Design a protein around this ligand. Structure first.
Ligand SMILES: O=C(O)C(=O)C[C@@H]1O[C@H](CO)[C@@H](O)[C@@H]1O[C@H]1O[C@H]([C@@H](O)CO)[C@@H](O)[C@H](O[C@H]2O[C@H]([C@@H](O)CO)[C@@H](O)[C@H](O[C@H]3O[C@H](CO)[C@@H](O)[C@H](O)[C@H]3O)[C@@H]2O)[C@@H]1O
Ligand SMILES: O=C(O)C(=O)C[C@@H]1O[C@H](CO)[C@@H](O)[C@@H]1O[C@H]1O[C@H]([C@@H](O)CO)[C@@H](O)[C@H](O[C@H]2O[C@H]([C@@H](O)CO)[C@@H](O)[C@H](O[C@H]3O[C@H](CO)[C@@H](O)[C@H](O)[C@H]3O)[C@@H]2O)[C@@H]1O
Ligand SMILES: O=C(O)C(=O)C[C@@H]1O[C@H](CO)[C@@H](O)[C@@H]1O[C@H]1O[C@H]([C@@H](O)CO)[C@@H](O)[C@H](O[C@H]2O[C@H]([C@@H](O)CO)[C@@H](O)[C@H](O[C@H]3O[C@H](CO)[C@@H](O)[C@H](O)[C@H]3O)[C@@H]2O)[C@@H]1O
Ligand SMILES: [Ca+2]
Ligand SMILES: [Ca+2]
Ligand SMILES: [Ca+2]
Ligand SMILES: [Ca+2]
Ligand SMILES: [Ca+2]
Lengths: 153, 152, 153
């Protein structure tokens, strides 16, 4: 029975090696041209624009959330997608509860930001959502405007 | 046996890490053109075709045209139709026996969601089925062009 | 002890058998409708057009390269995507001004080719890139024209 278990372990090693190698190829295929991997996070664009409320619902129904960069490296990876599509995108964070205090959907306060000079400026008094430009910088923006839909998984 | 335990313990971690990575890439795969329901996956091509061309695309890809067999499956399919704002073909036809809709296997329907007054065989020649944005079904001529959605 | 190993191996067998089924289904989902697998090579189209230099960059940044069919079987698989999108696509190969002829990106001479009759013809004196037509035949084409982006992985 030690001999039999040894045979079974050897077969499993071969099967796991096969899946690892096959899946490694498919990761690259899948992310071309609308995805970007950075650390343990994956950004994926829908390739079209929506208002914030509708963008948020699409990401949540897909089992993820709107793009939420938590470091300069995550932000630069997101910027790569935004540049390639040439369309600014919504982020997840809003200051709807408390004006000036932007938070994640959980209510946690920001661990990273990349605001353009002078932003947030609440231009017109009702900019409660956040966009990322093609240069990677952030701007507060009215939630009713349409921007590129990018989710994180 | 001591070597075997080391090898088994190593496999536990490798398999755990592979399943996590696979699960994450599968979620990414389905956004925004797919829907998972039970063991079934629907995926839209994002364009319209006549029935025979749509059928061939799905079969060449190793699947078949969307074939909702329950209310839950129909609702999942309805989400893609609503997202693209384009009615889609189902797999089922009454080509062989008028009035008797079947799956590609020849099996009779186990579920239906016909709109009021349907199926009506309009013009004496509606043998394919479209699903609308409200999730209801209408029989339609097979030569019309509709959203291509396959199941896998 | 041996009883312990048997319980661990039985669990692992269940997990791997599930992954094999799930992965095989997933491959079909990913390849529909923009991918084609041939031997150990996968072609995937971006589903849009670009000039050559931008096309080449997109493939390299994704961890692949521009489509480079090396056999009749590979060419016929690529032709299926080109036919499906009804758009001729760029290949990887270019006219080397040091070698005085078409080469792969490495500088090596072409082996397999499928030139259309009368090609390459350097029409107008500046056709330094290569495209594949919807009939599968090859044509030299100006690099600044926009053609379907297809990468290989
Ligand atoms: O961004 C948009 O598309 C807008 O919504 C532009 C709008 O145009 C009107 C201009 O009077 C405003 O209603 C609004 O522009 C303000 O708000 C913008 C965003 O916060 C909206 O969310 C902001 O980007 C604008 O500033 C930028 O553009 C102006 C100007 O070109 C707009 O026409 C620039 O003067 C400005 O740059 C200057 O200020 C910066 C920050 O203090 C400095 O870093 C820079 O050196 C200055 O030159 C900036 O580019 C505007 O506030
Ligand atoms: O609504 C849109 O999005 C359109 O762009 C279609 C156009 O909009 C107006 C809608 O009122 C119409 O002027 C026009 O719709 C005609 O053209 C459509 C196609 O060209 C593209 O889809 C066609 O589908 C329409 O027919 C459908 O809707 C009408 C009606 O509700 C709205 O016009 C139905 O009467 C019709 O259903 C009947 O005919 C079907 C066969 O054509 C039968 O299967 C069905 O059993 C009948 O009840 C169909 O649902 C319209 O001709
Ligand atoms: O959009 C384009 O492809 C072009 O760039 C068209 C341009 O039109 C001008 C015509 O003077 C030229 O500047 C250029 O067309 C030549 O170059 C084309 C490509 O090499 C561009 O990279 C080429 O496809 C053209 O050839 C085709 O058309 C001629 C045409 O004069 C009459 O139809 C055909 O003689 C030629 O025939 C060859 O291909 C056939 C299969 O399609 C074979 O049956 C035949 O034996 C061949 O000789 C071809 O159809 C042109 O050279
Ligand atoms: Ca605000
Ligand atoms: Ca602002
Ligand atoms: Ca009928
Ligand atoms: Ca009808
Ligand atoms: Ca030519």
């Amino acid at each position: 029975d030690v001999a039999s278990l040894r045979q079974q372990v050897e077969a499993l090693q071969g099967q796991v090696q096969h899946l690892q190698a096959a899946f490694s190829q498919y990761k690259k295929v899948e992310l071309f041209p609308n995805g970007q991997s950075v650390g343990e996070k994956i950004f994926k664009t829908a390739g079209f624009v929506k208002p914030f409320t509708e963008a948020q619902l699409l990401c949540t129904q897909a089992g993820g959330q709107l793009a939420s960069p938590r470091s300069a490296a995550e932000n630069a990876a997101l910027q790569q997608l935004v540049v390639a599509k040439n369309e600014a995108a919504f982020l997840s964070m809003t200051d709807s509860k408390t004006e000036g205090k932007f938070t994640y959907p959980t209510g946690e306060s920001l661990v990273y930001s990349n605001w353009a000079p002078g932003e947030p400026n609440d231009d017109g008094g009702s900019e409660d959502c956040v966009e990322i430009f093609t240069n990677g910088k952030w701007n507060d923006r009215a939630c009713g405007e349409k921007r590129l839909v990018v989710c994180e998984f």
